[PDB]
Each structure stands twice: as C-alpha cells, then as structure tokens.
Amino acid sequence: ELRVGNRYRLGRKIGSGSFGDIYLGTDIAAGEEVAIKLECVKTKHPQLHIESKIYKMMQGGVGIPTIRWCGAEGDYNVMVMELLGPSLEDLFNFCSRKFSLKTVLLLADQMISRIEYIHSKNFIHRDVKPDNFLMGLGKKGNLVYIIDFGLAKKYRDARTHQHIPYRENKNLTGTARYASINTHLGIEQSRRDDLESLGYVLMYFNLGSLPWQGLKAATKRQKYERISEKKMSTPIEVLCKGYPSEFATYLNFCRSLRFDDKPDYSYLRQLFRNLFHRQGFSYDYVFDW
Amino acid sequence: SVASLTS
Numbered sequence: 666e667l668r669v670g671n672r673y674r675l676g677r678k679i680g681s682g683s684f685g686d687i688y689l690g691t692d693i694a695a696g697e698e699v700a701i702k703l704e705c706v707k708t709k710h711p712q713l714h715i716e717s718k719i720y721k722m723m724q725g726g727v728g729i730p731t732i733r734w735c736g737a738e739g740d741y742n743v744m745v746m747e748l749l750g751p752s753l754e755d756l757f758n759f760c761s762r763k764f765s766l767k768t769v770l771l772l773a774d775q776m777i778s779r780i781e782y783i784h785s786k787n788f789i790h791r792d793v794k795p796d797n798f799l800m801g802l803g804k805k806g807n808l809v810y811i812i813d814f815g816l817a818k819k820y821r822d823a824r825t826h827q828h829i830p831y832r833e834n835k836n837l838t839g840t841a842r843y844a845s846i847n848t849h850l851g852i853e854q855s856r857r858d859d860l861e862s863l864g865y866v867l868m869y870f871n872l873g874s875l876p877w878q879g880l881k882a883a884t885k886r887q888k889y890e891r892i893s894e895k896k897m898s899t900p901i902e903v904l905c906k907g908y909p910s911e912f913a914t915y916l917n918f919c920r921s922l923r924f925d926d927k928p929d930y931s932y933l934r935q936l937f938r939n940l941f942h943r944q945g946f947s948y949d950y951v952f953d954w
Numbered sequence: 955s956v957a958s959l960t961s
Contacts, residue, residue: 683958710960792958816958838961878955892955 669743670734673699684712684815690745692733698748699733703741712815713742719788719814720746726782728775728801728810749799749810753870757795760953762873766909767946768953769870772798773937775809776866780859781930783811787823791816791854793862794843795869807950820855828925829853841892842878843869846920849893857922860933864916871908911936 667675669690676689685704692699704713717735724731734745753772757764764772776798783790790797792813801808816838821828832853839848843865845858869875877895882888901920905913914936922928941948 683960794956796956813958816960836961837959840956840958842955880955888955 668693669701669703669738669741670736670745672734673701673745675701682813682815684710684716685742689748700746700748702744702746704744706737706740706742711742713744716814716817717744719817720744722788723783723786723814726786728779728782728808730799730810730812746812748802749812750802750806751800752796753798753800753809754795756800756952756954757870763953764870765953766871766944767941767951769867770937770941770944770946771948771950771952772809772870773863773867774934774941776811776863777860777930777934777937779809779811780863781928783817784820784856784859784928787819787821787826788814788817789820789854789856790814790859791818792839793859793866794840795866828855831924837889841889842875846897849889849896853924855924856928857919857924857926860922860928861916861919864912864919867915868904868908868912871912876904909940911940 669675672694673690673692676691678686679689680687685702688701688703690699690701702713714735717732720732723729730749731747732744733747736743780790797811797813799810799812800806801810819829833851835851835853837844837848838854843862845861848854848858865875876899877892880888880891880895882891901913901916915933918933
C-alpha cells in the first residue's frame with residue numbers, strides 16, 4: 666500500500682495551499698489518523714522543512730500540534746502531523762456563518778494566548794486567519810490550536826532579543842482578506858500585525874463577512890488594490906458598528922503599536938474578559954456548535 | 955483574497 670515514512674497510509678486530499686497539499690493519513694502502527702503535508706521537491710520555495718523546524722521549536726506549547734515525522738520520500742518533502750478537528754472556518758460555515766458573542770469571546774481569549782505563545786518563542790506567524798485555527802479532538806475539543814507556520818519567521822534574536830529591522834516596499838505576505846493595514850502598505854511585519862489580523866478575524870466572525878470581501882476586479886494586481894483601498898477607507902468605528910466597543914478598542918490598540926513594541930496581551934485579553942462578564946456569560950466551553 | 959501569499 667502507499668505509505669509515507671513506511672508507516673502512514675495516504676488518504677484523501679483534505680486541503681491545499683501555496684506551500685503544499687494536505688492529506689488524511691493513517692498510522693499503521695496505531696490506527697491513529699494523522700495529517701500529511703506534502704511539498705514537491707522541485708519547488709521554487711523549499712519551505713516545508715523550515716516549517717517543520719518551527720513546529721519542533723514550539724512543541725509542548727498549549728495548542729501547538731505535535732509533529733510525528735518529517736523526511737524526504739520520492740518526489741516530496743513530507744511532514745506528518747497529529748490530526749486536529751475542524752477549523753474555525755469549518756465550524757463557522759457549519760454554524761451558518763453566525764457565531765454568538767459568547768463563542769467569539771471564548772475564541773478570542775485562546776487565540777490571543779496562542780499568538781502570545783508564538784511571539785514568546787521569537788516568531789511571528791504572518792498568516793492569522795480562521796482556516797489556521799483548529800479545535801482539538803475529543804477530549805481537547807475545547808482547545809483552540811494554531812497551525813500553518815509556512816510564512817512564520819523570527820522577529821528577534823533568540824539570545825539578544827534584538828528586533829529585526831524595519832523596512833518598507835515589501836510585497837504582500839499572508840492573505841489579503843485578513844492582512845494588517847501596514848502589510849498592505851508594504852511595511853515589514855511584526856508582532857502587532859498578527860494581532861491586528863486577529864482583530865479582523867473576530868469582526869469577521871461577528872459580521873459573517875468583511876466589507877472588503879467579495880469585491881469585483883479582474884487582475885490579482887487590481888484585486889489586492891481594491892481590498893487595500895476598501896480596508897483603509899473603512900474606519901474602525903464603521904467596521905465595528907453594531908458590536909461592543911471592545912472590538913474597536915482592540916483594533917485601535919493594535920494599530921497604535923509601534924513596529925518593535927511588545928503588545929500588552931493581558932490588556933487585550935482583559936478587554937474581552939470584562940465584556941464576557943458584563944454579558945453574564947460563564948466560561949463553560951459551550952460553543953455554538 | 956484568501957490565498958496565502960509569500961513575500
């Protein structure tokens with residue numbers, strides 16, 4: 666039978682991205698289902714092995730998937746991961762693209778913490794979006810995991826904590842829908858951008874769509890300009906109209922961080938915790954789904 | 955608009 670690593674049976678393709686395809690797999694040793702990421706060896710962009718190193722650097726952190734095997738086999742670089750549950754985009758669609766405020770706030774608290782953990786390990790993620798957060802399986806079904814480190818990079822030296830240098834004139838990295846304003850402006854990403862993107866993710870969950878989503882264009886050149894033009898022309902107070910002020914406060918705080926500033930993650934969690942209590946919610950892990 | 959882009 667077809668097995669990567671002599672050990673993982675290849676199953677159906679369950680996802681695609683710029684940095685490889687993802688397949689279901691089965692560990693023949695245990696019958697454990699896994700996720701198998703494949704990257705063609707003849708790729709412009711040797712990346713998967715770097716992503717695997719970052720996963721190894723983050724192992725043991727709460728909400729970080731476990732890497733089971735990496736290696737080269739045939740025409741592919743292979744990374745085998747623990748299989749997680751549905752993504753938040755999956756669950757959003759499952760819930761008919763409506764999440765309650767309670768579910769949004771339960772998710773926000775964990776997502777801020779996942780991003781903080783990555784930053785604590787000296788990396789920025791650079792591709793924060795609903796598809797890249799997955800719920801755990803079974804017992805860990807209440808835990809939000811973060812995936813996809815294919816665009817991640819160090820923002821500071823591990824020993825000296827010297828921050829990487831500021832630059833402009835950069836081409837867009839990440840996804841147009843959730844990228845920070847500064848990314849659209851060509852500015853080097855830093856910690857603040859991961860958190861701004863999360864702010865757009867949270868308003869997406871509240872609204873069902875973002876105002877710069879689904880714009881008519883033709884070229885990809887012109888489409889990203891359309892998005893960058895809309896995102897900038899929509900004030901945060903307009904974006905967040907009809908929702909608690911904490912969401913605007915969150916976004917304004919992220920936009921006000923300087924390039925090398927350390928975010929106050931505890932402040933941002935407490936904005937939403939305070940709202941959670943005001944609403945009378947209990948942190949009982951009853952999500953909408 | 956949802957494609958992962960590289961620098």
